[PDB]
């Protein structure tokens, strides 16, 4: 469809979202009080009861509807660019489907988090537990990550090799589709996200010892292959040298919680920086990122209230 006509509806829906002060002042309400405050929020129609389980389930339903119902008058040609954003949820669903099928886990035991692929098709692919069968049951033309899956599916049948090829190949295919996309904002955001994911995987894999050519994700807009190899190695100075990009926050730190906090904050501050390009997919990306951040912060605050904890003990959970 039209990236501008869809941009209008996206602007309306993204203006129909909770604000920073709502989370700031709703942190005092606890248990049922916080549940009712959420019931007053944008996701308010979902909120039924009180407590962390129901709060999380309602937040999941609200996300799966509001952000999971993208193709309304945006599908068609622009669909192949919009779906590129919705990657991780479908990736987790498909990797879980492959692991469960190759490990004997029940089909109904798999959560099948809604995303790019249909949950009914995922349940079918549970029967189609073969690699090629799952690829066929997930061959979405508008999600060329299906191609990387089939190539991974055709790469082998062993679960470990299939998954290890699938993750990296799908990340590379998504990055390449973004590179070939006629959208500067989308290309920039996706490349910076790939670089940040490489840095985070290096930090969480510091000392893992895998070959940097494989472990260090390609397409780095922050750290090259050698720079990520050094980050995996004992080079904390790599973090300080990684300054000058939007990811300039790193400074001699091998930490992981702070790394996640900073990466989330920087990616949010970048995805919110495209507001000046409404006709482009920048509005769609801002809406998606804001919906995800609000959902995460709301679920964290709900758990904190249902278990008597402060939500903002880590600022990474406040609104980001």
């Amino acid at each position: 469809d039209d990236f501008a006509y869809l941009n209008a509806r996206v602007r309306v829906r993204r203006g129909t979202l909770l604000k920073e002060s709502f989370f700031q002042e709703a942190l005092d309400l606890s248990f049922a009080d916080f549940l009712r405050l959420l019931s007053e929020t944008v996701y308010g129609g979902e909120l039924a009861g009180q407590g962390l389980p129901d709060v999380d389930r309602a937040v999941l339903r609200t996300q799966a509807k509001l952000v999971g119902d993208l193709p309304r008058l945006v599908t068609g040609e622009a669909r192949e660019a919009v779906r590129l954003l919705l990657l991780r949820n479908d990736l987790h669903n498909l990797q879980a489907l492959l692991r469960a099928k190759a490990t004997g886990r029940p089909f109904e035991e798999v959560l099948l988090l809604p995303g790019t692929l249909r949950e009914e098709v995922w349940r079918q692919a549970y029967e189609a537990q073969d690699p090629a069968g799952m690829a066929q049951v997930l061959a979405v033309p508008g999600h060329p990550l299906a191609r990387a899956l089939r190539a991974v599916l055709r790469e082998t049948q062993d679960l470990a090799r299939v998954e290890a090829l699938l993750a990296k190949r799908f990340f590379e295919d998504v990055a390449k589709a973004a590179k070939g996309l006629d959208q500067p904002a989308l290309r920039d955001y996706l490349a910076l996200e790939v670089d940040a994911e490489n840095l985070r995987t290096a930090f969480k894999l510091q000392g893992s010892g895998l070959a940097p050519d494989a472990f260090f994700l390609k397409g780095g807009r922050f750290v090259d292959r050698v720079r990520f190899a050094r980050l995996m190695e004992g080079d904390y100075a790599v973090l300080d040298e990684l300054s000058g990009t939007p990811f300039s926050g790193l400074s001699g730190v091998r930490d992981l919680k702070a790394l996640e906090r900073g990466l989330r904050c920087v990616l949010l501050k970048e995805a919110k920086k495209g507001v000046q390009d409404p006709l482009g997919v920048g509005l769609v990306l801002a809406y998606v990122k804001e919906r995800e951040w609000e959902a995460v912060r709301l679920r964290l605050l709900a758990r904190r209230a249902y278990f008597g904890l402060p939500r903002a003990q880590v600022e990474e959970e406040v609104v980001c």
Binding site: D1, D2, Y5, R72, L73
Partner: protein
């Protein structure tokens, strides 16, 4: 007549030809958006059709200019 007797005809034909581009522009986008949002916007299906039929004013004005030229010749 002589030069006028076909020059005015060409002037009206070019009038209509350049006018129809207005509809060709507007209606493509309007119809695409309406078809995209119709299945989810039954609350505006009539409104979508109204918005789609809105740009006929330019075609009407062009037909009016054509008729005025035909009367002038």
């Amino acid at each position: 007549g002589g030069l006028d007797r076909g020059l005015i005809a060409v002037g009206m034909g070019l009038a209509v030809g350049l006018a129809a581009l207005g509809t060709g522009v507007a209606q493509a986008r309007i119809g695409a958006a309406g078809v995209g949002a119709i299945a989810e916007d039954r609350s505006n299906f009539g409104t979508a059709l109204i918005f789609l039929l809105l740009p006929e004013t330019l075609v009407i004005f062009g037909l009016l200019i054509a008729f005025i030229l035909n009367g002038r010749l």
